[PDB]
């Protein structure tokens, strides 16, 4: 029943503006205060603001006063965060959360990512990873994809459109000189590759990029 | 402002064993209404934070009785009576009594696996696609190892290589008590073609000699 979904995150230059939204369902929205909480790249949690059910009483971080505006449209079950004069310190995953009797952040959304940077949006180059130096006697073979040189985060990776799920490791992206690189491995029975096709599906919403990269023998 | 000092920063514990996570506030966090809005959250890998405990010692609906909270004034403790793999992630304390509200820095709970696991190491040469574009990334996966301590180096024709190396790491999750790591060495096509042998070399408790994967550009 209860659902909270944030949106509007993305890349913005220092000094720029951005409006975040939080869509709510499954409860009487105006009966509850809502909060914004952000998670920094160092993974610290920071409370940003809390706004009353009726939308007219607000507590907020002093460091965002005069820069961020908090408000809600109770007729549309939506919470907003209007950001302006953005700073590097504002780079974070932004979560909305609903209160309840006795507890501050009872239900959370999935978060929306805000990146404050001078770097430009860059779509990924996706490269196939095939052996290599693997023993042909192995029951398994490990394949992969290299998702190289994109900006900003995030990217999504699936294998055979979700068909392959159990043998997958997708690694956190690493930033170098304004570009991210990520890799993903998948392990399948060696009797099934390359006789059967294995493909990594990569999407980068920030650039409207989608690449389906088939893994082929060298 | 209220500082929240949370210890330990991480916590290795065997399945079935107990853990205590401590939280100290820099001043009293009794709210003006007499209540103490001290809360505990758990963020599982790849998820949003979720509420465990509110008003110091109250369990949120659905939260197992294995979790219990105690304390008063400035000293608080989350106790886990016996740990399960699903308990993996980062625990945060939070005070909602005095604005600005503040979080502790988090405690990463880790499972002390009952058996060791040697890494499965795979090395991947640059794809012909990437080479044509003028780049050459060599990738090494080191998958499903325990314990966490591992040393990894790149060698080019036997010489250790430091520059152009990026490393990414995954911790454990509820379905995998092991760790995995990815390393990528990026060269230009021309530099790649000036050498013969590329090596990913790991040192881990599970072997008395280096675990080596290598290929020759042939």
């Amino acid at each position: 029943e209860v659902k909270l979904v944030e949106s509007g995150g993305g890349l913005v230059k220092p000094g720029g503006s951005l409006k975040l939204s939080c869509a709510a369902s499954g409860f009487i929205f105006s009966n509850y205060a809502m909060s914004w909480v952000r998670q920094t790249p160092e993974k610290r949690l920071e409370w940003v603001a809390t706004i009353s059910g009726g939308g007219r009483n607000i507590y907020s971080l002093d460091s965002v006063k005069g820069r961020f505006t908090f408000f809600r449209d109770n007729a549309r079950n939506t919470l907003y965060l209007q950001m302006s004069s953005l700073r590097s310190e504002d780079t974070a995953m932004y979560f909305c959360s609903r209160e309840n009797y006795g507890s501050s952040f009872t239900y959370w959304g999935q978060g929306t990512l805000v990146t404050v940077s001078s770097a430009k949006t860059t779509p990924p180059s996706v490269y196939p990873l095939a052996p290599g130096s693997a023993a042909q006697t192995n029951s398994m073979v490990t394949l992969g994809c290299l998702v190289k040189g994109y900006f900003p985060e995030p990217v999504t990776v699936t294998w055979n459109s979700g068909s392959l799920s159990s043998g997958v490791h997708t690694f956190p992206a690493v930033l170098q000189s304004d570009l991210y690189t990520l890799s993903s491995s998948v392990t399948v029975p060696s009797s099934t590759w390359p006789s059967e096709t294995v493909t990594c599906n990569v999407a980068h919403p920030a650039s409207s990029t989608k690449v389906d990269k088939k893994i082929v023998p060298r | 402002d209220v500082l929240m000092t949370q210890t330990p920063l991480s916590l290795p514990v065997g399945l079935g064993d107990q853990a205590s996570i401590s939280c100290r506030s820099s001043q009293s966090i009794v709210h003006s209404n007499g209540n103490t809005y001290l809360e505990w959250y758990l963020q599982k890998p790849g998820q949003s934070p979720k509420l465990l405990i509110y008003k110091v010692s109250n369990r949120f609906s659905g939260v197992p009785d294995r979790f219990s909270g105690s304390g008063s004034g400035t000293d608080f403790t989350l106790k886990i009576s016996r740990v399960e793999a699903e308990d993996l992630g980062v625990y945060y304390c939070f005070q909602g009594s005095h604005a600005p509200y503040t979080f502790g820095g988090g405690t990463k709970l880790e499972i002390k696996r009952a058996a060791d696991a040697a890494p499965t190491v795979s090395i991947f040469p640059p794809s012909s696609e990437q080479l044509t574009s003028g780049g050459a990334s060599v990738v090494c996966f080191l998958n499903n190892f325990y314990p966490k301590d591992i040393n990894v180096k790149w060698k080019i024709d036997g010489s250790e290589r430091q520059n152009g190396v990026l490393n990414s790491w995954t911790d454990q999750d509820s379905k995998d008590s092991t760790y995995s790591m990815s390393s990528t060495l990026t060269l230009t096509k021309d530099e790649y073609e000036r050498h013969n042998s590329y090596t990913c070399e790991a040192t881990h408790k599970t072997s008395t000699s280096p675990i080596v994967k290598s290929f020759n550009r042939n």
Partner: peptide
């Protein structure tokens, strides 16, 4: 007591 504290149900027992 702050008449403008934003919590709507949290502070109710």
């Amino acid at each position: 007591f702050d008449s403008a504290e934003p919590w709507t149900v949290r502070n109710e027992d």
